[PDB]
Amino acid sequence: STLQKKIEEIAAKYKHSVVKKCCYDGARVNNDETCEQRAARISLGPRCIKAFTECCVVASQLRANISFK
């Protein structure tokens, strides 16, 4: 367990943490604007932008395809 391995572990935790935040931010309902419009106002990294956009797009499809067995 080198120092390299411990830092790579922390770095991966940071990225996963960022993605998780950006995703659920995009997953929030926003009826006024499209996902592309909302993500255009994000000045953060491309990692955050992709997480935001994908979750925003997917969240919208899930909300429109919700049913009851």
Author numbering: 677 to 745
Could you give the paper's own sentences about this structure?
Upon complement activation, a cascade of proteolytic events generates the complement effectors, including the anaphylatoxins C3a and C5a. Anaphylatoxin signalling through the G-protein coupled receptors (GPCRs) C3aR and C5aR leads to various cellular responses including chemotaxis, oxidative burst, the release of pro-inflammatory molecules and activation of the adaptive immune system. As for C3a, C5a activity is regulated by carboxypeptidases that cleave off the C-terminal arginine residue, producing the C5a-desArg molecule which has a distinct bioactivity pattern and generally a much lower potency than C5a, in part owing to its tenfold to 100-fold decrease in C5aR binding affinity. Here, we have reported the crystal structures of the human C5aR antagonist hC5a-A8 and of the two murine anaphylatoxins mC5a and mC5a-desArg.
C5a-derived receptor antagonists have also been sought using phage-display libraries. This screening identified a mutant form of C5a, C5a-A8Δ71–73, as a potent antagonist of both C5aR and C5L2. Furthermore, we determined the crystal structure of human C5a-A8 at 2.4 Å resolution. Interestingly, hC5a-A8 forms a three-helix bundle with an extended N-terminal helix as seen for hC5a-desArg. The final model encompasses residues Thr678–Lys745 (residues 1–68 in C5a numbering) and the penultimate hC5a-A8 residue, Arg746, could be modelled in one of the four molecules related by NCS in the asymmetric unit (monomer C). Despite these major differences, the three disulfide bridges that stabilize the helix packing in all previously reported C5a structures are preserved in hC5a-A8 and connect Cys698–Cys724 (H1′–H3′), Cys699–Cys731 (H1′–H3′) and Cys711–Cys732 (H2′–H3′). In hC5a, the short sequence preceeding the core region (residues Tyr690–Ser693) forms a loop that allows the N-terminal segment to pack back against the C5a core in an H1 helical motif antiparallel to H2. In contrast, residues Tyr690–Ser693 of hC5a-A8 form an additional helical turn prior to H2, allowing the latter to merge with the N-terminal helical segment into the long helix H1′. This arrangement is reminiscent of that observed for hC5a-desArg. Although the C-terminus of hC5a-A8 is shortened compared with hC5a, it could be traced almost entirely for all four molecules in the asymmetric unit. In this context, the structuring of hC5a-A8 into a β-strand motif extending outside the helix-bundle core could provide a mechanistic model for the two-step binding mode of hC5a to its receptor.
